[PDB]
Symmetry: C2
Subunit: 265 residues, 2 copies
Amino acid sequence: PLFDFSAGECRFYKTLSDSEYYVKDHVVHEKTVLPGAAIIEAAREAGERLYGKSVIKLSQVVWAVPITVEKEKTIMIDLLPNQKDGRFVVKTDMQPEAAVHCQGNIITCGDQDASHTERFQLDSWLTGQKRLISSAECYRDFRQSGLEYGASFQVIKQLFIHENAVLARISLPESIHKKSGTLLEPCLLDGIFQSTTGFTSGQEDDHTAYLPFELGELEILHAPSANGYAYITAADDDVKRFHILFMDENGSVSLKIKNLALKAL
Amino acid sequence: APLFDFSAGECRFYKTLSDSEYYVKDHVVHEKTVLPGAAIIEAAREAGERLYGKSVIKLSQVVWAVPITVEKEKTIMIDLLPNQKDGRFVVKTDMQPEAAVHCQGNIITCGDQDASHTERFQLDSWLTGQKRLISSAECYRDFRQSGLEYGASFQVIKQLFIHENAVLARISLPESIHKKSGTLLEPCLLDGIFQSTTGFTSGQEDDHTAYLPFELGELEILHAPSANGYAYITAADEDDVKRFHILFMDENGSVSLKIKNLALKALRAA
């Protein structure tokens, strides 16, 4: 580029539809709602478009209650420059008094940024578990809580419940067509969030639905695999906090989630 | 493709220009280094492709004020405002409303399913029979007489063929520097296309008026222009403002750029 501009503020617009799989198959208390994870990928795409470089981190994310999407609904993502980085604000109504559905910081990688890799020792966590939760149990419990995940979002195949950790096997369904540009598939990322249910499910009498409320940091080391494992620990009421690593079957870590907070709905 | 294919709203882009850059350093107008008007066109094109994520195929209804002077470093602001699928651009260096608009115009993007069409020009007949042939050295001496001192980067006119109702200019970019692959409209190429109107605007031998870009009805980009080619200039017609149509093409007449109603305006020395 002969003129390598610095971008100022910019608003991006997208009309969501319940025709899209990430809406129609995400039913919360009998309503189709945009998953909070989808807002993360939308912010990442807007940032990559405006700044012309990879977004490697999203931090200090805060969610309101999910955006309900019945037929069409237009969302606005406002990107505000913060030095080389940016911050985003997501709304559906324009007036200043209107609710912010999601907000957070965008961090881009620089031209000379270094390559850093992380590896997880998976083997010991595939055996010795206290309890094993099958996909069928996991999503029956979710539905009894009011979280009716369609097949596209049924990505958890097994939960290994250990004493102080949960290992979740995750696999994207063949049905969804994953675009080359889509780094964070909403169903993948929501399934990573879902896997905290290995902790929050609790008693058989408890049918509480927990949804994303805050996220300290999401770090992208590289494009996530369609199949892999999430390793979840409690970060340490109505709010539950966790750290999560997402990795491929050989322990190559693709995503790091620090301080994911979910709140009872 | 992107899972979220956004429509972009308004956005401002910022660039600090320096007279260290060749497209400024070698563009001296009445003893001042000024940003060429042609350079703003490529800047608007680049901003548009960045913001809209689609090829810019046309810039239309462009209006220029007097050139932006650049002594050491100066920051320009390009404001892109949405116009349905298309866009509008406004170029400023000063922020307040009272400040001058240096350049403005419309940006038109291409669609995903737009058709493929090519245009060719019968070039050969215009390389002979001319009333007058003007050499590169003569061309830039005449420019200097008017206060337009083009440095080596902008000395892209190699020959002007002066015909009765048309001018054919042979244009060739200098070896010095290679346009980045991403730069579609190299400022020195596009300014040379603007320069070639001097085959008309020179006028009388005693007249040494400098004409600079003032308006541009339409610039259509059919495909990436060649570094070497020919400009075919005709008078739009219809004293201080001269209007032209221009085609830019390669040696086989393959048209890469179409210019409708380029208006140049006399600029008096300070």
